[PDB]
Amino acid sequence: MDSNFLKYLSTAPVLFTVWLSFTASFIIEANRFFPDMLYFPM
Amino acid sequence: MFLISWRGYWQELIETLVWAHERTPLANLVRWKDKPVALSIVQARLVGLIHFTAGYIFTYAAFVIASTTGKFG
Amino acid sequence: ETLNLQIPSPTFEGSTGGWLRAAEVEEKYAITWTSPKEQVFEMPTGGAAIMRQGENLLYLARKEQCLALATQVKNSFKITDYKVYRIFPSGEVQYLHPKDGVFPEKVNAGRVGVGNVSHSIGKNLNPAQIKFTSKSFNG
Amino acid sequence: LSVVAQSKSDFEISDGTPYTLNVPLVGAASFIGWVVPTLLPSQIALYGGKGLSTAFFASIGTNLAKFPAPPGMTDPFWLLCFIWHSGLFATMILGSIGYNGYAG
Amino acid sequence: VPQTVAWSAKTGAVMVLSNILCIVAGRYVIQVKSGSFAGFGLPELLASTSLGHIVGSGAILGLSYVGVL
Amino acid sequence: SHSVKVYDTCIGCTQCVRACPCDVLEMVSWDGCKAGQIASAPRTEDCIGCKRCETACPTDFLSVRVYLGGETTRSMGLAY
Amino acid sequence: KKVSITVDRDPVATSFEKWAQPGHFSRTLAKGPKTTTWIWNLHADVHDFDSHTNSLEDISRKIFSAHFGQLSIIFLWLSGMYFHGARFSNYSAWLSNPTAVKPSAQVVWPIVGQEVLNGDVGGGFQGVQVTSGFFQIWRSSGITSEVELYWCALAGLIMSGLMIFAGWFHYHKAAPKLEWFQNAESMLNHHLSGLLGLGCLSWAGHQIHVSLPVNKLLDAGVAPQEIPLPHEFLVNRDLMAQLYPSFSKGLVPFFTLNWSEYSDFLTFKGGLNPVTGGLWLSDTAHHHLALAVLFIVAGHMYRTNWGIGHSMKEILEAHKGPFTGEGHKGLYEILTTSWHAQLAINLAMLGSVSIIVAHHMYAMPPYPYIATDYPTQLSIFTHHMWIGGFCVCGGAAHAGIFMVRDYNPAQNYNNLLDRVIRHRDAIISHLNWICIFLGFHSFGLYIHNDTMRALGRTQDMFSDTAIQLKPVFAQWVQSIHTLAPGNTTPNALATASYAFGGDVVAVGNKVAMMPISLGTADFMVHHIHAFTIHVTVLILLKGVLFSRNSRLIPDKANLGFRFPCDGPGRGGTCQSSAWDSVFLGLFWMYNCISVVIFHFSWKMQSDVWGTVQSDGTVTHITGGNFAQSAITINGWLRDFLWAQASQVIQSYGSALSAYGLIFLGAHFIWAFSLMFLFSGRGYWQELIESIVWAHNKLNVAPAIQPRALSITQGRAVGLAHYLLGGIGTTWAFFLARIISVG
Amino acid sequence: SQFIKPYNDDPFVGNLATPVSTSSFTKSLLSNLPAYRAGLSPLLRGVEIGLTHGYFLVGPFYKLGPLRNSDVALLSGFFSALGLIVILVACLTIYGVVSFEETEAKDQLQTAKGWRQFTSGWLVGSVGGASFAYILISNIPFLQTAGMSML
Ligand code: CLA
Ligand code: CLA
Ligand code: CLA
Ligand code: CLA
Ligand code: CLA
Ligand code: CLA
Ligand SMILES: CC1=CCCC(C)(C)[C@H]1/C=C/C(C)=C/C=C/C(C)=C/C=C/C=C(C)/C=C/C=C(C)/C=C/C1=C(C)CCCC1(C)C
Ligand SMILES: CC1=C(C/C=C(\C)CCC[C@H](C)CCC[C@H](C)CCCC(C)C)C(=O)c2ccccc2C1=O
Ligand SMILES: CC1=C(C/C=C(\C)CCC[C@H](C)CCC[C@H](C)CCCC(C)C)C(=O)c2ccccc2C1=O
Ligand code: SF4
């Protein structure tokens, strides 16, 4: 893959948008399979 | 108005008002002893702060007194 | 040296941006300059005027207006022949700029330094030290 | 009639420029020029079978008979007069432009 | 509804008149271009006949409106 | 008037003098720096307080310092 | 043939290299960041092409391809609106019962309980109710099925692909030269004739062959799947002559000028269709045909390649009189060499047109069943008032950018610009006096009324039951418009709009339109409107006229269009740039448009919208309280804001709870903006110093040194969050209120 | 032809010579107004201006004041107009004290003696014009209404 296109994908806004979309996305998935966790179950 | 808009806009308006007074007949017979200028930067901050604070006090005083009076409870 | 009051003014159609009663009762500024051409420039107080070939003369209310026009003529028409005067309602004419024939950004002999402080800015005196004292904070 | 089409009083539209306002000629010609086409009749309730100029003149007459009372909101007087005056002002403006400027 | 008429030679007469009127007017008033044999070309003819169909259509419809037909 | 001071850290770059819109500043001779010249403020009665001189100054802390003071017609920038 | 196509082939190489080099487009930013200001400066100046390049040719090429990029985004947006209507909507159920089903084309996923937003909109469907009026557009178009909505979505995607291809091609492969862009006569001829004229003519053809038969069958009562497909009207001329018998004669009446044959489908009815509460589509077809004719005629005015036509330069230079010097001389050169001058004009006109759209679409409801869909009427009026106000303020922003940058006094001697600049004090002082006179005698009437009602003196108020300020001129104009059918518009059958007077049009027992009477409250709020518009004009005009120089700063043009100040001297020159008058005029635009949309909402609920019970009596949403309560500020506070905020604040736990949350969130953002507006940069830089110290202590300081935002950026951030919060608060308030009650 | 020119031949003064500013008709009105008319003492200038202003002052107070619907409306309208005139005379007096230093000349408005004469004239004229308006309104029923007596 082009090294300049990869250098574009390494720019701060792209990484920030991708990383926070991935982060938001596994919060969403964790609340889909394990919803309403008001407490650590113990 | 004093907190958002700052001096340069107002000084340029006031210069157009100084021109209009000097050019209007029957009105340029009357002259200011003090040249009209826009408020200073710090003064405008103080005036906006006073207006903000006075409005804050008067609004809440009217509310806390009237709502408690009207309810009695 | 003195302002020749008879120098022809650059052609101009008038504007409301000119000087007001304070010029005729407190002070007025005048600027003269030589133009090699009959060319259009921008007035500091408004629209466009045409400077006449030969000697031009203007009247403005503020010194900054005369110098803003001077900066303009030098930058665009390369006219470095500009002399700025102050005129009082008594008729007294006061030459202003360049004050000794040489521009201020060029050094000149016989200029005495005013306002020069022998130490750096961090070496000034604290306000408490000079409270209720006439001593100046610049050391 | 500040100045008519003649060199009577030294009139000056501005500080130093004399200018002959042709108030007789322009006012008369604009009045007639607007009125003759305006006579064109129309079997519309606003006109009533007359032209705009004739209906406007008739409306002045009918409301002048009831002299203190003003014409009502639905009275045709207000529509007829506004259109007639708007056309008269426009033909006066255009007439003043044509005569004063083109001079012929 | 304003009254229009089926095409007759009268309609044609109005159209022909208007087209010729505009051809002569275009020889007079077109500022950028043998009264009709100097500098007369296809864009001038096509413009004067386009205005002829506009003036002619308006005249036909108006004369139908008022009763002249 | 406003009070304008020049401290002996001036490198004699003349930038303050060129940036001043009211011809307050000028260059005088001085052996302290390499350029052989220092800025001077002989005409502070004309200072309007714009602080364009301070903006122009490149020494770490400003060699030229404007201290806004009493207001006059000249220092208020009033054409009326 | 001096109008010709000229193109540079392969100008710019399609490379990813400059993608990897943020800031490549300017000499300042291309050397990399050293403070955080660089990051902000990168975004602030990026589409300012004439700040990066000197040549008008490269600027023009960048603009043409960016306009293709915008078109690609708009086509993608339209395609998504059609796809969500096709796939996630109750459109098919709404076609059967337009008066019972509420349009809904947005469905949420069930994640954190957010599926409560899928309310019961009707038609066996759950989703978010939509208010953009797309369903009524589609019914007016004659869509009648989700399959045709899928084909519209695909047509939008194909157009989106073609526009992004055209932008790439015309910047990187075949870029036109500057002499191509500087063809104003050709561009106007094609955009009047080709774009607008053939746009109207082609749409008129669709209305006649598809919209009219399909909507006649729908309004007759035929079920949508029982209606013939739109091409069977195109082919079976007998089936079309059943609905419209004039089609039996074909196109012979068109060509022979026997146009009164076509009165079946080209009508001049006026008024509204009683079944749908919308404009007669035969009228819209005739309207678009007539507009098409005179747009094609207008696009033949200007001279291109054959000697016929006008030169726009000659027209402009010939209009000069004795008051105005050289006249319009030099305006052609301005408008064919400055993009900012063109954008200033086109933005002011586009904003004005959007404001006209807002008034005309509520008063003469064009689509079937949009008049009684009250959430749509309020949404599209409010939306197009906000688009209009923003675009008008950008027209003054780009008039200032022109004056600061593209204006040259040498080429503008003694013409109209020179003369405006040379009496700008007389203009600004007279406008200033008008704004004072008009605030005193409009808002001061409200304060007089607050005081009199509070003091027990109701006989001393400006009201209908007291001292009356009647709008006689507006009432007279309404009278004329009701008298026009058969009188001054003799062949019209009904009035242009029932707002002027006349009948009550009811559809599904809800009022479509009915006369909007004007009283003392209407006199007062119309002068409020004139006051806020005059003040906004004052701020924006003062910024344009004093953009280059003042009595305060004689060389303002050397500082630029956007500078924060020129120091604390001369008493203080904070906010002296032309940018700062756009900044201050967007607040007053917000004030003006907020009062307009509040006036519309309260007046329509109080005096127009509602239900028609037996005997023809109408019960309005708020029961006619505008007349006696819109005359005081306490009336607006109590009977409009307080009374009607009940739905947003009680919305929690329902499908409208999203509006309750956005109401609160926008209150938050609005308040948060005041942190940036009332504050100064120096405080925040000194606070950042201590924060930087704590980072140095832990050896974690960044190499891009943090800075407080610039003075201008603090102002821009404050204004953006102010408008976002205030408009958002009204958006949530308007939508939850009218969805619950209308 | 050009209708706008520099003011009094001076291109750099802050004014323009426009038809509103400097036409023959405008010059005739300004020159003949009492403030600028030649041959008038400062006192007579004050009297003529005072009569005009006092006369129109009575009407708005009378028709729109708090006691407008009462039968004492004209008396209230006169007293309120007189009260305003008394305040305005004080405004004229304080202006004269600060603005002008004492000198022998008394023939011009912009002199301490002249301004005092203008104030004396304006006071008498305003009282006289307000009194005249009072007499006329008291006696003539057309003026008491807006002309509504005819309908
Ligand atoms: C253009 C306007 C528009 C808007 C505002 C929406 C809005 C929506 N759509 Mg619709 N849609 C549109 C157009 C639009 N659509 C078009 C044109 C189509 C046809 C293809 C569709 C087809 C469609 C379907 C089929 C569905 C939606 C759905 C949705 C909803 C959820 C979308 C979601 O969360 O996925 C998020 C999906 C992701 C993969 C997350 C991606 C996030 C990344 C990180 C964004 C990053 C952008 C990137 C960084 C840009 C830079 C590029 C890079 C090189 C630097 C939402 C209401 C869903 C719905 O309503 O379900 C009920 C649904 O199922 N849409
Ligand atoms: C008939 C000729 C014609 C037409 C239709 C247009 C149309 C347009 N031009 Mg113009 N243009 C023309 C001639 C024409 N131009 C000429 C001759 C010149 C040289 C002087 C220019 C120079 C020019 C510039 C410099 C710019 C435009 C822009 C635009 C767009 C304006 C934004 C808009 O409303 O688009 C939305 C409206 C639409 C209808 C979208 C339609 C998209 C296509 C391209 C329209 C035409 C399709 C096709 C002809 C129809 C086929 C019908 C078939 C199914 C039977 C629009 C696409 C601006 C723009 O956005 O550039 C992209 C712009 O900046 N044009
Ligand atoms: C155009 C709309 C509008 C606007 C701009 C205002 C503006 C104002 N109102 Mg008014 N008001 C309005 C409409 C409006 N009002 C309407 C329609 C009503 C109903 C009739 C009221 C009823 C009303 C009352 C009853 C009160 C105000 C107050 C205020 C003032 C707030 C001052 C301030 O800085 O907030 C500062 C804001 C706060 C201190 C708290 C904000 C209110 C929140 C919702 C409650 C508190 C939450 C909690 C304690 C804190 C959470 C902490 C956080 C960590 C999450 C200000 C004068 C109040 C006032 O004078 O303040 C002293 C006051 O008492 N207004
Ligand atoms: C409304 C009546 C009317 C109209 C339309 C015209 C129109 C014209 N006159 Mg005439 N004129 C009029 C009244 C009018 N005049 C009267 C009353 C007088 C006598 C005092 C004259 C005396 C006069 C002279 C002496 C001359 C003209 C000339 C001209 C021509 C160009 C100069 C001009 O005025 O530009 C006006 C330009 C236009 C009208 C075309 C521009 C198109 C726009 C849309 C203008 C529309 C303005 C307005 C809305 C139209 C109102 C119509 C109606 C409702 C009142 C133009 C054909 C000159 C000329 O060319 O000689 C033949 C010339 O020498 N006129
Ligand atoms: C940010 C910009 C923006 C956004 C998001 C919207 C969003 C919307 N608009 Mg609005 N609009 C805007 C700007 C915007 N508008 C501006 C600037 C104008 C003024 C020209 C309008 C005028 C407008 C009209 C007239 C209509 C909408 C409608 C709509 C809705 C349906 C969208 C659609 O399919 O259009 C569909 C649009 C149509 C089917 C008809 C459009 C007909 C106009 C006359 C086309 C003109 C195009 C032409 C090239 C523009 C020339 C401008 C002129 C000054 C030269 C939606 C709420 C429609 C609506 O309310 O539906 C309920 C609607 O009828 N808009
Ligand atoms: C056709 C419309 C149009 C066009 C092409 C332009 C084009 C331009 N404008 Mg103009 N402008 C417009 C409309 C337009 N503007 C309008 C409507 C306004 C009124 C607000 C202005 C006001 C304006 C000012 C005041 C200035 C410009 C400037 C500029 C230039 C720089 C653009 C740039 O780099 O910004 C980059 C773009 C951004 C940084 C985008 C961020 C903007 C906002 C805050 C984000 C949007 C918020 C979003 C919609 C909602 C978020 C949802 C939320 C809940 C999260 C460029 C030539 C600037 C300049 O210097 O020109 C020489 C300048 O100073 N314009
Ligand atoms: C009309 C018109 C048309 C065209 C446009 C326009 C020009 C703008 C407009 C003009 C409008 C305007 C602005 C018209 C303005 C008109 C005005 C204000 C006229 C004032 C008249 C004053 C009078 C008669 C005073 C009389 C006092 C007297 C007699 C003294 C009485 C007393 C004295 C001392 C002596 C003893 C007895 C008493 C009683 C005590
Ligand atoms: C409106 C406004 C003005 C114009 C305001 C002016 C000129 C104030 C003039 C006050 C008028 C003349 C009277 C109001 C005085 C008070 C109502 C009462 C004064 C008497 C008591 C205080 C004793 C500025 O000069 C200004 C300057 C810098 C930043 C913002 C602004 C600003 O917002
Ligand atoms: C808070 C504040 C700051 C400091 C504000 C800063 C440093 C902004 C903080 C941004 C941080 C670094 C990132 C957080 C951004 C948000 C999470 C979302 C931003 C969305 C856009 C930036 C994309 C100023 O610099 C300032 C200057 C002039 C007047 C008023 C103020 C002012 O009020
Ligand atoms: S700028 Fe600072 S350093 Fe350069 S000359 Fe003026 S004072 Fe000396």
Author numbering:
A (entry chain J): 1 to 42
B (entry chain B): 661 to 733
C (entry chain D): 3 to 141
D (entry chain O): 22 to 125
E (entry chain K): 10 to 42, 51 to 86
F (entry chain C): 2 to 81
G (entry chain A): 11 to 189, 192 to 754
H (entry chain L): 2 to 152
Question: What do the authors of the reporting publication say about this deposited model?
Answer:
Photosynthetic cryptophytes are eukaryotic algae that utilize membrane-embedded chlorophyll a/c binding proteins (CACs) and lumen-localized phycobiliproteins (PBPs) as their light-harvesting antennae. Here, we solved four structures of cryptophyte PSI-CAC complexes purified from Rhodomonas salina (Rs) cells grown at L- and S-phase. The R. salina cells grown for six and 12 days (corresponding to L-phase and S-phase) were harvested, and utilized to isolate PSI-CAC complexes. We then solved four structures of PSI-CAC complexes purified from cells in both growth phases, containing either 14 or 11 CACs, and termed them as PSI-14CACL-phase and PSI-11CACL-phase for L-phase models, and PSI-14CACS-phase and PSI-11CACS-phase for S-phase models. Comparison of the four structures reveals how cryptophytes adjust their PSI antennae in response to the different growth state.
Consistent with the trimeric organization of CACs, both PSI-11CAC structures lack one CAC trimer, but at distinct positions. PSI-11CACL-phase loses the inner trimer-e/f/g which attaches to PsaO, whereas PSI-11CACS-phase lacks the outer trimer-l/m/n, which links to the inner layer through chain-s. Accordingly, PsaO is untraceable in the PSI-11CACL-phase structure, and chain-s is absent in our PSI-11CACS-phase structure. While PsaQ is also absent in our PSI-11CACS-phase structure, it binds to PSI-11CACL-phase at the same lumenal position as that in PSI-14CACL-phase. While the two L-phase structures contain PsaQ, we did not observe the density corresponding to PsaQ in our two S-phase structures. Moreover, the two CpPSI-ACPI complexes purified from L-phase cells exhibited structures almost identical to our two L-phase PSI-CAC structures, and appeared to contain the lumen-localized PsaQ (Unk1 in CpPSI-ACPI)12. Together, these results suggested that PsaQ is strongly associated with the PSI-CAC complex in L-phase cells, but does not or only loosely bind to the PSI-CAC in S-phase cells. In comparison, the fact that PsaQ is absent from (or loosely bound to) PSI-CAC in S-phase cells is in line with the idea that photosynthesis is less efficient in S-phase cells. When cryptophytes enter the S-phase, changes of physiological conditions inside the chloroplast, such as lumen pH values, may weaken interactions between PsaQ and PsaB/CAC-i, resulting in the detachment of PsaQ and the reorganization of the antennae of both photosystems. Additionally, the PSI-11CAC complexes exhibit different organization of peripheral antennae at particular growth phases. The final overall resolutions of maps of R. salina PSI-14CACL-phase, PSI-11CACL-phase, PSI-14CACS-phase, PSI-11CACS-phase are 2.7 Å, 3.0 Å, 2.9 Å and 3.3 Å, respectively.
